[PDB]
Structure formats: structure tokens, C-alpha cells
PDB file of C-alpha atoms in Angstrom:
ATOM      1  CA  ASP C 529     -30.119 -24.357  75.417  1.00  0.00           C
ATOM      2  CA  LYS C 530     -28.685 -26.176  78.439  1.00  0.00           C
ATOM      3  CA  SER C 531     -27.988 -22.925  80.243  1.00  0.00           C
ATOM      4  CA  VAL C 532     -31.825 -23.056  80.749  1.00  0.00           C
ATOM      5  CA  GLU C 533     -32.378 -26.756  80.170  1.00  0.00           C
ATOM      6  CA  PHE C 534     -31.817 -29.169  83.150  1.00  0.00           C
ATOM      7  CA  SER C 535     -31.152 -32.910  83.076  1.00  0.00           C
ATOM      8  CA  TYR C 536     -33.428 -35.042  85.200  1.00  0.00           C
ATOM      9  CA  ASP C 537     -30.233 -36.196  87.101  1.00  0.00           C
ATOM     10  CA  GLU C 538     -29.182 -32.749  87.949  1.00  0.00           C
ATOM     11  CA  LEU C 539     -32.598 -32.127  89.463  1.00  0.00           C
ATOM     12  CA  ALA C 540     -32.743 -35.587  91.245  1.00  0.00           C
ATOM     13  CA  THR C 541     -29.326 -35.200  92.657  1.00  0.00           C
ATOM     14  CA  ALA C 542     -30.223 -31.714  93.955  1.00  0.00           C
ATOM     15  CA  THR C 543     -33.483 -33.075  95.467  1.00  0.00           C
ATOM     16  CA  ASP C 544     -32.140 -36.413  96.770  1.00  0.00           C
ATOM     17  CA  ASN C 545     -34.284 -38.245  94.154  1.00  0.00           C
ATOM     18  CA  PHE C 546     -37.175 -35.843  95.041  1.00  0.00           C
ATOM     19  CA  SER C 547     -37.180 -36.688  98.808  1.00  0.00           C
ATOM     20  CA  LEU C 548     -40.261 -35.737 100.835  1.00  0.00           C
ATOM     21  CA  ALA C 549     -37.972 -33.856 102.935  1.00  0.00           C
ATOM     22  CA  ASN C 550     -37.301 -31.303 100.148  1.00  0.00           C
ATOM     23  CA  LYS C 551     -41.037 -30.746  99.403  1.00  0.00           C
ATOM     24  CA  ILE C 552     -42.230 -27.058  99.800  1.00  0.00           C
ATOM     25  CA  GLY C 553     -45.610 -27.227  98.309  1.00  0.00           C
ATOM     26  CA  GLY C 554     -48.711 -28.671  94.737  1.00  0.00           C
ATOM     27  CA  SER C 555     -45.768 -31.015  94.269  1.00  0.00           C
ATOM     28  CA  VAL C 556     -42.937 -28.440  94.569  1.00  0.00           C
ATOM     29  CA  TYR C 557     -39.512 -29.254  95.557  1.00  0.00           C
ATOM     30  CA  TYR C 558     -36.628 -26.997  96.959  1.00  0.00           C
ATOM     31  CA  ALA C 559     -33.274 -27.307  95.297  1.00  0.00           C
ATOM     32  CA  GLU C 560     -29.971 -25.430  94.896  1.00  0.00           C
ATOM     33  CA  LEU C 561     -29.219 -25.319  91.214  1.00  0.00           C
ATOM     34  CA  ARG C 562     -26.068 -23.765  89.760  1.00  0.00           C
ATOM     35  CA  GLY C 563     -25.669 -21.380  92.644  1.00  0.00           C
ATOM     36  CA  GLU C 564     -29.374 -20.410  92.842  1.00  0.00           C
ATOM     37  CA  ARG C 565     -32.136 -21.207  95.224  1.00  0.00           C
ATOM     38  CA  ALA C 566     -34.784 -22.831  93.151  1.00  0.00           C
ATOM     39  CA  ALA C 567     -38.353 -24.323  93.298  1.00  0.00           C
ATOM     40  CA  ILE C 568     -38.836 -27.286  91.044  1.00  0.00           C
ATOM     41  CA  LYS C 569     -42.378 -28.203  89.953  1.00  0.00           C
ATOM     42  CA  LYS C 570     -43.485 -31.507  88.272  1.00  0.00           C
ATOM     43  CA  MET C 571     -45.942 -30.843  85.523  1.00  0.00           C
ATOM     44  CA  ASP C 572     -47.792 -34.119  84.742  1.00  0.00           C
ATOM     45  CA  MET C 573     -47.366 -33.635  81.025  1.00  0.00           C
ATOM     46  CA  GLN C 574     -44.904 -32.998  78.240  1.00  0.00           C
ATOM     47  CA  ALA C 575     -44.817 -31.173  74.906  1.00  0.00           C
ATOM     48  CA  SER C 576     -42.466 -30.372  72.072  1.00  0.00           C
ATOM     49  CA  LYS C 577     -45.119 -28.022  70.882  1.00  0.00           C
ATOM     50  CA  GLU C 578     -44.245 -24.320  70.436  1.00  0.00           C
ATOM     51  CA  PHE C 579     -44.584 -24.342  74.299  1.00  0.00           C
ATOM     52  CA  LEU C 580     -40.864 -25.513  74.436  1.00  0.00           C
ATOM     53  CA  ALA C 581     -40.055 -22.287  72.594  1.00  0.00           C
ATOM     54  CA  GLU C 582     -42.786 -20.563  74.551  1.00  0.00           C
ATOM     55  CA  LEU C 583     -40.858 -21.743  77.631  1.00  0.00           C
ATOM     56  CA  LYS C 584     -37.649 -20.304  76.058  1.00  0.00           C
ATOM     57  CA  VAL C 585     -39.238 -16.720  75.805  1.00  0.00           C
ATOM     58  CA  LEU C 586     -40.632 -17.198  79.278  1.00  0.00           C
ATOM     59  CA  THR C 587     -37.098 -17.639  80.722  1.00  0.00           C
ATOM     60  CA  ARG C 588     -36.116 -14.204  79.275  1.00  0.00           C
ATOM     61  CA  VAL C 589     -38.843 -12.441  81.509  1.00  0.00           C
ATOM     62  CA  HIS C 590     -36.769 -10.638  84.295  1.00  0.00           C
ATOM     63  CA  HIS C 591     -38.524  -8.301  86.629  1.00  0.00           C
ATOM     64  CA  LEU C 592     -38.139  -7.615  90.327  1.00  0.00           C
ATOM     65  CA  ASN C 593     -41.912  -8.211  90.907  1.00  0.00           C
ATOM     66  CA  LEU C 594     -42.241 -11.462  88.848  1.00  0.00           C
ATOM     67  CA  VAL C 595     -41.193 -14.907  89.769  1.00  0.00           C
ATOM     68  CA  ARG C 596     -38.503 -15.742  87.294  1.00  0.00           C
ATOM     69  CA  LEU C 597     -38.607 -19.017  85.324  1.00  0.00           C
ATOM     70  CA  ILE C 598     -35.002 -20.187  85.691  1.00  0.00           C
ATOM     71  CA  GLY C 599     -35.312 -23.045  83.319  1.00  0.00           C
ATOM     72  CA  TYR C 600     -36.925 -26.388  82.665  1.00  0.00           C
ATOM     73  CA  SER C 601     -36.289 -30.033  81.951  1.00  0.00           C
ATOM     74  CA  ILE C 602     -37.440 -32.050  78.760  1.00  0.00           C
ATOM     75  CA  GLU C 603     -36.100 -35.514  79.699  1.00  0.00           C
ATOM     76  CA  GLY C 604     -39.669 -36.960  79.726  1.00  0.00           C
ATOM     77  CA  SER C 605     -41.994 -35.365  82.344  1.00  0.00           C
ATOM     78  CA  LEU C 606     -42.128 -31.520  82.173  1.00  0.00           C
ATOM     79  CA  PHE C 607     -40.172 -29.906  85.078  1.00  0.00           C
ATOM     80  CA  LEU C 608     -40.398 -26.110  85.479  1.00  0.00           C
ATOM     81  CA  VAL C 609     -37.692 -24.708  87.729  1.00  0.00           C
ATOM     82  CA  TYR C 610     -38.358 -21.195  89.317  1.00  0.00           C
ATOM     83  CA  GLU C 611     -36.563 -18.936  91.664  1.00  0.00           C
ATOM     84  CA  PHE C 612     -37.321 -19.818  95.336  1.00  0.00           C
ATOM     85  CA  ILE C 613     -39.335 -17.164  97.205  1.00  0.00           C
ATOM     86  CA  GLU C 614     -38.656 -17.757 100.846  1.00  0.00           C
ATOM     87  CA  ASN C 615     -41.662 -16.096 102.702  1.00  0.00           C
ATOM     88  CA  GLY C 616     -44.842 -17.721 101.539  1.00  0.00           C
ATOM     89  CA  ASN C 617     -47.669 -16.186  99.633  1.00  0.00           C
ATOM     90  CA  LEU C 618     -49.963 -13.197 100.329  1.00  0.00           C
ATOM     91  CA  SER C 619     -52.989 -15.356 101.063  1.00  0.00           C
ATOM     92  CA  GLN C 620     -51.055 -17.018 104.011  1.00  0.00           C
ATOM     93  CA  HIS C 621     -50.093 -13.636 105.359  1.00  0.00           C
ATOM     94  CA  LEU C 622     -53.584 -12.350 105.226  1.00  0.00           C
ATOM     95  CA  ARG C 623     -55.477 -15.424 106.669  1.00  0.00           C
ATOM     96  CA  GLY C 624     -52.996 -18.189 107.295  1.00  0.00           C
ATOM     97  CA  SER C 625     -52.010 -19.077 110.854  1.00  0.00           C
ATOM     98  CA  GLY C 626     -48.764 -18.466 112.607  1.00  0.00           C
ATOM     99  CA  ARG C 627     -47.808 -15.116 110.868  1.00  0.00           C
ATOM    100  CA  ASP C 628     -48.091 -11.723 112.315  1.00  0.00           C
ATOM    101  CA  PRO C 629     -50.474  -9.213 110.566  1.00  0.00           C
ATOM    102  CA  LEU C 630     -49.173  -7.230 107.699  1.00  0.00           C
ATOM    103  CA  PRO C 631     -48.812  -3.511 108.478  1.00  0.00           C
ATOM    104  CA  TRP C 632     -50.981  -1.250 106.364  1.00  0.00           C
ATOM    105  CA  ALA C 633     -47.952   0.395 104.871  1.00  0.00           C
ATOM    106  CA  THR C 634     -46.559  -3.134 103.894  1.00  0.00           C
ATOM    107  CA  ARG C 635     -49.806  -4.099 102.271  1.00  0.00           C
ATOM    108  CA  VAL C 636     -49.698  -0.926 100.086  1.00  0.00           C
ATOM    109  CA  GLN C 637     -46.176  -1.761  98.962  1.00  0.00           C
ATOM    110  CA  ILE C 638     -47.192  -5.296  98.110  1.00  0.00           C
ATOM    111  CA  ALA C 639     -50.079  -4.026  96.051  1.00  0.00           C
ATOM    112  CA  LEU C 640     -47.698  -1.588  94.322  1.00  0.00           C
ATOM    113  CA  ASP C 641     -45.124  -4.409  93.758  1.00  0.00           C
ATOM    114  CA  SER C 642     -47.799  -6.744  92.234  1.00  0.00           C
ATOM    115  CA  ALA C 643     -49.338  -3.941  90.072  1.00  0.00           C
ATOM    116  CA  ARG C 644     -45.938  -2.995  88.642  1.00  0.00           C
ATOM    117  CA  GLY C 645     -45.312  -6.739  87.679  1.00  0.00           C
ATOM    118  CA  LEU C 646     -48.640  -6.809  85.901  1.00  0.00           C
ATOM    119  CA  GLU C 647     -47.973  -3.398  84.233  1.00  0.00           C
ATOM    120  CA  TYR C 648     -44.876  -4.958  82.852  1.00  0.00           C
ATOM    121  CA  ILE C 649     -46.444  -8.037  81.363  1.00  0.00           C
ATOM    122  CA  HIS C 650     -49.410  -5.961  80.008  1.00  0.00           C
ATOM    123  CA  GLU C 651     -47.429  -3.317  78.304  1.00  0.00           C
ATOM    124  CA  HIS C 652     -43.773  -4.171  77.981  1.00  0.00           C
ATOM    125  CA  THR C 653     -42.836  -7.859  77.476  1.00  0.00           C
ATOM    126  CA  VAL C 654     -42.378  -9.143  74.001  1.00  0.00           C
ATOM    127  CA  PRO C 655     -44.948 -10.560  73.614  1.00  0.00           C
ATOM    128  CA  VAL C 656     -47.356  -9.025  76.070  1.00  0.00           C
ATOM    129  CA  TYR C 657     -49.161 -11.469  78.371  1.00  0.00           C
ATOM    130  CA  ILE C 658     -52.516 -11.645  80.061  1.00  0.00           C
ATOM    131  CA  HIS C 659     -52.122 -13.551  83.362  1.00  0.00           C
ATOM    132  CA  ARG C 660     -55.622 -14.910  83.651  1.00  0.00           C
ATOM    133  CA  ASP C 661     -55.165 -16.369  87.108  1.00  0.00           C
ATOM    134  CA  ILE C 662     -54.325 -13.375  89.252  1.00  0.00           C
ATOM    135  CA  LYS C 663     -55.088 -14.119  93.046  1.00  0.00           C
ATOM    136  CA  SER C 664     -53.617 -13.672  96.453  1.00  0.00           C
ATOM    137  CA  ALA C 665     -52.041 -17.291  96.384  1.00  0.00           C
ATOM    138  CA  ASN C 666     -50.127 -16.060  93.160  1.00  0.00           C
ATOM    139  CA  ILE C 667     -48.441 -13.216  94.950  1.00  0.00           C
ATOM    140  CA  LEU C 668     -45.388 -14.426  96.729  1.00  0.00           C
ATOM    141  CA  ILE C 669     -43.501 -12.499  99.547  1.00  0.00           C
ATOM    142  CA  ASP C 670     -39.879 -12.373 100.079  1.00  0.00           C
ATOM    143  CA  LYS C 671     -37.922 -11.783 103.455  1.00  0.00           C
ATOM    144  CA  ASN C 672     -38.286  -8.020 102.949  1.00  0.00           C
ATOM    145  CA  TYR C 673     -42.149  -8.396 102.318  1.00  0.00           C
ATOM    146  CA  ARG C 674     -41.774  -7.322  98.700  1.00  0.00           C
ATOM    147  CA  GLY C 675     -44.176  -8.963  96.329  1.00  0.00           C
ATOM    148  CA  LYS C 676     -43.702 -11.073  93.106  1.00  0.00           C
ATOM    149  CA  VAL C 677     -46.402 -12.268  90.898  1.00  0.00           C
ATOM    150  CA  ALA C 678     -46.155 -16.027  89.937  1.00  0.00           C
ATOM    151  CA  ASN C 679     -47.402 -18.471  87.301  1.00  0.00           C
ATOM    152  CA  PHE C 680     -48.017 -16.068  84.249  1.00  0.00           C
ATOM    153  CA  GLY C 681     -47.811 -17.411  80.706  1.00  0.00           C
ATOM    154  CA  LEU C 682     -48.844 -20.852  82.008  1.00  0.00           C
ATOM    155  CA  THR C 683     -52.325 -20.798  80.375  1.00  0.00           C
ATOM    156  CA  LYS C 684     -51.747 -23.249  77.513  1.00  0.00           C
ATOM    157  CA  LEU C 685     -51.132 -26.036  79.976  1.00  0.00           C
ATOM    158  CA  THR C 686     -54.632 -25.813  81.249  1.00  0.00           C
ATOM    159  CA  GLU C 687     -56.559 -24.943  78.013  1.00  0.00           C
ATOM    160  CA  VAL C 688     -54.553 -27.221  75.775  1.00  0.00           C
ATOM    161  CA  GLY C 689     -65.852 -27.314  78.153  1.00  0.00           C
ATOM    162  CA  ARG C 690     -63.083 -25.884  80.179  1.00  0.00           C
ATOM    163  CA  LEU C 691     -62.192 -22.589  81.735  1.00  0.00           C
ATOM    164  CA  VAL C 692     -58.884 -20.991  83.114  1.00  0.00           C
ATOM    165  CA  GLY C 693     -59.442 -19.105  86.257  1.00  0.00           C
ATOM    166  CA  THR C 694     -60.186 -19.376  89.974  1.00  0.00           C
ATOM    167  CA  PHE C 695     -63.614 -18.972  91.649  1.00  0.00           C
ATOM    168  CA  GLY C 696     -64.003 -15.338  93.087  1.00  0.00           C
ATOM    169  CA  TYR C 697     -61.623 -13.734  90.661  1.00  0.00           C
ATOM    170  CA  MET C 698     -63.284 -13.975  87.328  1.00  0.00           C
ATOM    171  CA  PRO C 699     -65.007 -10.894  85.822  1.00  0.00           C
ATOM    172  CA  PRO C 700     -68.649 -11.036  84.674  1.00  0.00           C
ATOM    173  CA  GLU C 701     -67.734 -10.809  80.922  1.00  0.00           C
ATOM    174  CA  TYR C 702     -65.473 -13.830  81.277  1.00  0.00           C
ATOM    175  CA  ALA C 703     -67.724 -16.074  83.379  1.00  0.00           C
ATOM    176  CA  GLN C 704     -70.753 -15.308  80.937  1.00  0.00           C
ATOM    177  CA  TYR C 705     -69.156 -14.937  77.632  1.00  0.00           C
ATOM    178  CA  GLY C 706     -65.596 -16.325  77.718  1.00  0.00           C
ATOM    179  CA  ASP C 707     -64.213 -12.776  76.699  1.00  0.00           C
ATOM    180  CA  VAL C 708     -60.491 -12.413  77.528  1.00  0.00           C
ATOM    181  CA  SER C 709     -58.712  -9.150  77.739  1.00  0.00           C
ATOM    182  CA  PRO C 710     -56.149  -7.482  80.065  1.00  0.00           C
ATOM    183  CA  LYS C 711     -59.215  -6.238  81.976  1.00  0.00           C
ATOM    184  CA  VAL C 712     -59.666  -9.795  83.256  1.00  0.00           C
ATOM    185  CA  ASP C 713     -56.395  -9.276  85.178  1.00  0.00           C
ATOM    186  CA  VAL C 714     -57.536  -5.747  86.402  1.00  0.00           C
ATOM    187  CA  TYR C 715     -60.712  -7.219  87.823  1.00  0.00           C
ATOM    188  CA  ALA C 716     -58.771 -10.027  89.743  1.00  0.00           C
ATOM    189  CA  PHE C 717     -56.392  -7.404  90.972  1.00  0.00           C
ATOM    190  CA  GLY C 718     -59.314  -5.508  92.410  1.00  0.00           C
ATOM    191  CA  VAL C 719     -60.283  -8.565  94.401  1.00  0.00           C
ATOM    192  CA  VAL C 720     -56.704  -8.830  95.788  1.00  0.00           C
ATOM    193  CA  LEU C 721     -56.978  -5.191  96.843  1.00  0.00           C
ATOM    194  CA  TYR C 722     -60.094  -5.992  98.634  1.00  0.00           C
ATOM    195  CA  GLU C 723     -58.356  -8.878 100.345  1.00  0.00           C
ATOM    196  CA  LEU C 724     -55.573  -6.533 101.425  1.00  0.00           C
ATOM    197  CA  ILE C 725     -58.163  -4.256 102.964  1.00  0.00           C
ATOM    198  CA  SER C 726     -60.356  -6.894 104.659  1.00  0.00           C
ATOM    199  CA  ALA C 727     -58.195 -10.049 104.856  1.00  0.00           C
ATOM    200  CA  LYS C 728     -61.346 -11.847 103.715  1.00  0.00           C
ATOM    201  CA  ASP C 729     -61.278 -14.669 101.225  1.00  0.00           C
ATOM    202  CA  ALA C 730     -62.346 -13.948  97.650  1.00  0.00           C
ATOM    203  CA  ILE C 731     -65.159 -16.451  98.536  1.00  0.00           C
ATOM    204  CA  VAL C 732     -66.961 -15.496 101.724  1.00  0.00           C
ATOM    205  CA  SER C 733     -71.994 -17.640 100.242  1.00  0.00           C
ATOM    206  CA  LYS C 734     -70.916 -14.102  99.443  1.00  0.00           C
ATOM    207  CA  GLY C 735     -68.235 -12.564  97.325  1.00  0.00           C
ATOM    208  CA  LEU C 736     -65.991  -9.649  98.480  1.00  0.00           C
ATOM    209  CA  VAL C 737     -66.803  -7.526  95.510  1.00  0.00           C
ATOM    210  CA  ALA C 738     -70.597  -7.354  96.287  1.00  0.00           C
ATOM    211  CA  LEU C 739     -69.931  -6.701  99.879  1.00  0.00           C
ATOM    212  CA  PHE C 740     -67.867  -3.731  99.162  1.00  0.00           C
ATOM    213  CA  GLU C 741     -70.139  -2.468  96.425  1.00  0.00           C
ATOM    214  CA  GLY C 742     -73.053  -2.198  98.871  1.00  0.00           C
ATOM    215  CA  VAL C 743     -70.788  -0.469 101.394  1.00  0.00           C
ATOM    216  CA  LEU C 744     -69.250   1.861  98.968  1.00  0.00           C
ATOM    217  CA  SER C 745     -72.696   2.660  97.481  1.00  0.00           C
ATOM    218  CA  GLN C 746     -73.561   4.734 100.564  1.00  0.00           C
ATOM    219  CA  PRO C 747     -73.405   8.603 100.907  1.00  0.00           C
ATOM    220  CA  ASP C 748     -70.999   8.233 103.864  1.00  0.00           C
ATOM    221  CA  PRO C 749     -69.391   4.649 103.604  1.00  0.00           C
ATOM    222  CA  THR C 750     -66.841   5.432 106.281  1.00  0.00           C
ATOM    223  CA  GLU C 751     -68.656   3.717 109.283  1.00  0.00           C
ATOM    224  CA  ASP C 752     -69.530   0.566 107.320  1.00  0.00           C
ATOM    225  CA  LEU C 753     -65.943   0.638 105.711  1.00  0.00           C
ATOM    226  CA  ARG C 754     -64.443   0.454 109.041  1.00  0.00           C
ATOM    227  CA  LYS C 755     -66.227  -2.795 109.814  1.00  0.00           C
ATOM    228  CA  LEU C 756     -64.743  -4.213 106.610  1.00  0.00           C
ATOM    229  CA  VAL C 757     -61.211  -3.428 107.574  1.00  0.00           C
ATOM    230  CA  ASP C 758     -59.059  -6.390 108.860  1.00  0.00           C
ATOM    231  CA  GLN C 759     -59.640  -6.421 112.535  1.00  0.00           C
ATOM    232  CA  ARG C 760     -55.982  -7.534 113.088  1.00  0.00           C
ATOM    233  CA  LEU C 761     -54.847  -4.036 111.970  1.00  0.00           C
ATOM    234  CA  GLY C 762     -56.862  -2.471 114.784  1.00  0.00           C
ATOM    235  CA  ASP C 763     -57.041   1.335 114.398  1.00  0.00           C
ATOM    236  CA  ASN C 764     -53.405   1.366 112.900  1.00  0.00           C
ATOM    237  CA  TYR C 765     -54.401   2.648 109.367  1.00  0.00           C
ATOM    238  CA  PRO C 766     -54.953   5.868 107.627  1.00  0.00           C
ATOM    239  CA  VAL C 767     -58.628   6.168 106.892  1.00  0.00           C
ATOM    240  CA  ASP C 768     -58.228   8.085 103.622  1.00  0.00           C
ATOM    241  CA  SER C 769     -55.603   5.696 102.291  1.00  0.00           C
ATOM    242  CA  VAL C 770     -58.154   2.735 102.928  1.00  0.00           C
ATOM    243  CA  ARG C 771     -61.001   4.539 101.222  1.00  0.00           C
ATOM    244  CA  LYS C 772     -58.755   5.358  98.261  1.00  0.00           C
ATOM    245  CA  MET C 773     -57.672   1.897  97.936  1.00  0.00           C
ATOM    246  CA  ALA C 774     -61.286   0.658  98.277  1.00  0.00           C
ATOM    247  CA  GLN C 775     -62.513   3.131  95.686  1.00  0.00           C
ATOM    248  CA  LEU C 776     -59.793   1.924  93.423  1.00  0.00           C
ATOM    249  CA  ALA C 777     -60.653  -1.659  93.880  1.00  0.00           C
ATOM    250  CA  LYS C 778     -64.337  -0.671  93.086  1.00  0.00           C
ATOM    251  CA  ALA C 779     -63.196   0.927  89.957  1.00  0.00           C
ATOM    252  CA  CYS C 780     -61.054  -2.265  89.036  1.00  0.00           C
ATOM    253  CA  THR C 781     -64.145  -4.612  89.629  1.00  0.00           C
ATOM    254  CA  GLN C 782     -66.958  -2.680  87.639  1.00  0.00           C
ATOM    255  CA  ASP C 783     -69.189  -4.672  85.340  1.00  0.00           C
ATOM    256  CA  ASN C 784     -67.967  -2.959  82.134  1.00  0.00           C
ATOM    257  CA  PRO C 785     -64.484  -3.930  81.398  1.00  0.00           C
ATOM    258  CA  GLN C 786     -63.921  -0.914  79.166  1.00  0.00           C
ATOM    259  CA  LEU C 787     -64.324   1.464  82.235  1.00  0.00           C
ATOM    260  CA  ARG C 788     -61.857  -0.482  84.422  1.00  0.00           C
ATOM    261  CA  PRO C 789     -58.564   1.348  84.650  1.00  0.00           C
ATOM    262  CA  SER C 790     -55.368   0.000  83.156  1.00  0.00           C
ATOM    263  CA  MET C 791     -52.525  -1.266  85.224  1.00  0.00           C
ATOM    264  CA  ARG C 792     -50.526   1.730  84.399  1.00  0.00           C
ATOM    265  CA  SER C 793     -53.128   4.029  85.873  1.00  0.00           C
ATOM    266  CA  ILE C 794     -53.532   1.593  88.840  1.00  0.00           C
ATOM    267  CA  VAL C 795     -49.799   1.973  89.558  1.00  0.00           C
ATOM    268  CA  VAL C 796     -50.141   5.802  89.564  1.00  0.00           C
ATOM    269  CA  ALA C 797     -53.045   5.700  91.982  1.00  0.00           C
ATOM    270  CA  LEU C 798     -51.262   3.312  94.477  1.00  0.00           C
ATOM    271  CA  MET C 799     -48.357   5.505  94.406  1.00  0.00           C
ATOM    272  CA  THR C 800     -50.700   8.386  95.724  1.00  0.00           C
ATOM    273  CA  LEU C 801     -52.355   6.300  98.436  1.00  0.00           C
ATOM    274  CA  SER C 802     -48.812   5.123  99.201  1.00  0.00           C
ATOM    275  CA  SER C 803     -47.229   4.518 102.576  1.00  0.00           C
TER     276      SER C 803
END
């Protein structure tokens, strides 16, 4: 339908024929479309497969913690139009330059926001989704520092040997066997929790998960855990909340996928170690 289908001319006029001035990321262009701030992404492809109808179902997903697919354009090249999230992504806030450090309380709220979004697509959408590419760069931040999960349901574009995923976020059963389940997302979310605690990259030579595993394997991990906490936080964090988050992330990144918690249980826990 044209309430969700955009003509190329409407997008070109709104981007000044895709001027470099309107680029925001990537190949992403900012535009104001039908009274909404939007982010237009050129996909170097096109498909009247069920993906067109799969794009239709994607546009009906509406959640405060998911980046909404506003619409699309099938005039030739595939254009996906998304709501514009104005304050970057979590990876930039944790490690990118120019930005102040996130307070611990704000990091907990972002974790809770992201988990609620994942809980919704795991349990409540029709149909349910597995994201398969959760990572800090896919958590976008608004002006009030609330989090929104981006780029879910976009897997057929990649798969249709190959693998979907990002280095540092894939669980052992997927890397070694190709097994896909919602627990793939749980594992990756655990890595994000470790990034929130440490502000280290998912990579570094060393993976975050093994570094925390060795620390948490100690009788009293508190002294070694403090070394792993983001130095930009200083002493401004509750030690028990960080411990609870670290232990939750450890449970999320266990080898056995059947023993990782569900997103619903993850939400409950994060509300406990809240802020």
C-alpha cells in the first residue's frame, strides 16, 4: 500500500537527489517524509519475493524499544525507510569520541529497554522473530538516552558458504554447528551487557566473554571485577548492581544454550538490579 510505499521521486525530492549533505551513515540519508523524521537506506538489491509481503508485516511492528520500519520503495532499487533516531548508537556512547560517559543508571535503563524490545519479538510479534545480529551498534539512542533495537527481520537479505552474524557476538553452537534459536540473541545480549560494564569492544586477540568468565570464576571476583569496570565511570557505580549484571551476562553467555535464560527472565532480573 502507498501509505507504506514511497515513490523514488518522493525520496529524491526529500533528500535533494540524495545529496551528500543529507548522508548520516552505511549509505543512510536523513529526510522528512510525510511529517516524520526518517532515515532512508539504499539496499543494493530488489525482490518481489515474499520479502515484499515480509516487508509489509515488518511495517506493522510498533514498539517503543524497536526502530520502526516506516515504509519502503519498490521503484527499482530497494529503499528501506526507518524512523530517525537522533542520538547515535550505544557503541559510540561507550567507546566513540566526543561523548560524555554514560552514567551507570542510564546504562541499566538502556539494557532494560533493549531487553524489552527483544522480549517483544521473541514472544509477542506475529510471527515471532530471531534478530540474529544483536550488538551494541544495533542499539540506537534517543535524546532522552532511551534505547531502541534496530535491523531485526533483515536476515533474508543476507542469507538469500555464508553466515549471518557479527564477530564477537556469535554463540558456540552457532559458530560450530549453524544452530539457530532465540538463545542466539540471548548470548549476543550478554556480550552487550559486558560492553555496558566494561566499555570494551566485543573483540579485544581476546573476547569479552572469556575475560569475564575467568574473573567471575574466582571465589571473590570483586577486586578483579573492579578492574574490568569502565574507568570513565570512576567510583560512581553500585558494586552489587554491577555484580548482578555481570552474573546475568555470564548466565546469558553459557556454552549450553538450553541453560541461558529467556528474555522474559532477563527483563525481570534487570528490573531488580535497576537504577
